[PDB]
Amino acid sequence: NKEQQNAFYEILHLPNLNEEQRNGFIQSLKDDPSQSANLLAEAKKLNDAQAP
Amino acid sequence: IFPPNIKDVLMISLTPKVTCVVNNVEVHTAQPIQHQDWMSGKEFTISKIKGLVRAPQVYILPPPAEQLSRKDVSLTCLVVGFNPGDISVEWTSNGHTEENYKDTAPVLDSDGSYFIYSKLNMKTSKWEKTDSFSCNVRHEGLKNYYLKKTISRS
Amino acid sequence: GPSVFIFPPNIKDVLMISLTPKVTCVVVDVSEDDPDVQISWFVNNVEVHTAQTQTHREDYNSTIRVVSTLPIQHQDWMSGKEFKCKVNNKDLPSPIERTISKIKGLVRAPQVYILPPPAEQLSRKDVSLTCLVVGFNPGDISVEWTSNGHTEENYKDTAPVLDSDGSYFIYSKLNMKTSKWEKTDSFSCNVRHEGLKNYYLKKTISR
Ligand SMILES: *[C@@H]1O[C@H](CO[C@@H]2O[C@@H](C)[C@@H](O)[C@@H](O)[C@@H]2O)[C@@H](O[C@@H]2O[C@H](CO)[C@@H](O[C@H]3O[C@H](CO[C@H]4O[C@H](CO)[C@@H](O)[C@H](O)[C@@H]4O[C@@H]4O[C@H](CO)[C@@H](O)[C@H](O)[C@H]4NC(C)=O)[C@@H](O)[C@H](O[C@H]4O[C@H](CO)[C@@H](O)[C@H](O)[C@@H]4O[C@@H]4O[C@H](CO)[C@@H](O)[C@H](O)[C@H]4NC(C)=O)[C@@H]3O)[C@H](O)[C@H]2NC(C)=O)[C@H](O)[C@H]1NC(C)=O
């Protein structure tokens, strides 16, 4: 419930992710919210990677 | 043609649906949409119209003093200064959901924002027996899209 | 083709005797080329002729809007007489009738409470005074604000919302400077309703 929400809220505002990455991060998040913790970190670091 | 319910969009654990009664690419699953396709403004015709997007203040008002001599009282949740008008207020006592509430329409305030009032009726026995009442707001302006301000009797 | 809309009197005009209720008929999309429109009025199918009808140019879509206001007596509105407006034009084969009438039925006085600003809001530049009016039938009500005898005009209020018991509740929010909430000695919420003694009840608060 609560963890997988802050997940969704941050993933949606990560500014260097592209459409498809964000799209698949959510999908791969509402399908087994267990790894909500790890899926943030994953998207988090893939953002910094793709900064200009 | 209608938008989806705003609580359905601002929480990933629910499903927003566009009702006839996607950017010119056919989809064959009607009877439901991705939360992100609506927020970034795709055309379904209808879209999520953005404008100024201000975040609400959320205060709980207790029963007015004059009403506490009665057999029923009224909790008030005033939510102020938000945009767009679309918002979702709902009530809990600790963790169990209270649903004898009614709420007004979003009203345009003087600064072009919106306020909304929500009113939980309960027996006066319930107001002094139950330890917490929490009012639960879901606007896009809020962090995590969620906000929970709580009042207790004293 | 043109269309007619009918509109019931101002709840403030009804709940004060010195003032004068009016029923109104508005005609929209009257062609600029035939702005002549005939309007007859029928308080209980009795034709009446006191209707004041004006013809207006709607500069937005280049059409004519006709407005006929028939002033009425309190007792005929309050009793539930059925006011009717017939409207005939060239662009109307056979005319168009609108009818309106008060909803005689259940009536309940409101309770009226002033809610002080929430505790968390005392610290900004502006506060919010709440007037909670609950339990009234029918849904037509009037809430205004005063601080002593000086009328306050920065109020906004909600639609009467139907509560659970079949009553209407309503909220009126007076925003003000936080200096005003602490400077001024008394703020009054003032409700008019057809269920109150003298159609009026005043509730007043201090800091
Ligand atoms: C050409 O342009 C004009 C003007 O354009 C308008 O104004 C410009 C400036 C632009 O802003 C533009 O976008 C606007 O469109 C168009 O004129 C409009 O035409 C509409 C119909 O096509 C007509 O429809 C609604 O009328 C009622 C609302 O009107 C009141 O509120 C308006 C909002 O502020 C205001 O403009 C009006 O003046 C009017 O105000 C009130 O007037 C009283 C009399 O003077 C006064 O006492 C009162 O104080 C005052 N208050 C306020 C706050 O203004 C609606 O109620 C009405 O609803 C009915 O019809 C629709 C569909 O038919 C339903 O969805 C409704 O539910 C309702 O049906 C009734 O339902 C009830 C139950 O719900 C039943 O019991 C009844 O039997 C039903 N029928 C009746 C007759 O009651 C309309 O939705 C606009 O009012 C009208 N405005 C004006 C100013 O003329 C015009 O159409 C254009 N032509 C085109 C596009 O071809």
Numbering used by the authors:
A (entry chain D): 6 to 57
B (entry chain B): 242 to 262, 279 to 288, 307 to 319, 335 to 444
C (entry chain A): 237 to 443
Tell me, in the authors' exact words, what the paper reports.
Immunoglobulin G (IgG) is a crucial mediator of the defensive mechanisms for eliminating infectious microorganisms. To gain mechanistic insights into the molecular process behind these interactions, we attempted to observe the dynamic interactions of an anti-GM1 monoclonal autoantibody, GB2. This autoantibody was generated by immunization of mice with GM1-like lipo-oligosaccharide purified from a C. jejuni strain isolated from a patient with Guillain–Barré syndrome. Our study visualized antigen-dependent assembly of the GB2 antibodies on model membranes, giving rise to hexameric ring structures, which particularly interacted with C1q.
The bacterial IgG-binding proteins, protein A and protein G, have been reported to inhibit C1q binding to IgG antibodies. Our HS-AFM data showed that GB2 scarcely formed the hexameric ring structure in the presence of the B domain of protein A, which is known to bind the Fc region of IgG antibodies. We solved the crystal structures of the Fc fragment of GB2 and that of the same IgG isotype in the absence or presence of the B domain of protein A, respectively. Our crystallographic data also confirmed that, as in the case of previously reported crystal structures, the Fc interacts with the B domain of protein A at the cleft between the CH2 and CH3 domains, which is also involved in protein G binding. These data indicate that the antigen-dependent hexameric ring formation of IgG is mediated by Fc–Fc interactions, which is disrupted by competitive binding with protein A. Intriguingly, the mouse anti-GM1 IgG2b(κ) antibody GB2, in which positions 345, 430, and 440 are occupied by alanine, glutamic acid, and threonine, respectively, were highly preorganized into the hexameric ring on the antigenic membrane formation without artificial mutations. These amino acid residues are not directly involved in the binding to the B domain of protein A, which, however, sterically inhibits Fc–Fc interaction. Therefore, the inhibition of C1q binding by protein A and protein G is, at least, partially attributed to the prevention of Fc-mediated ring formation.
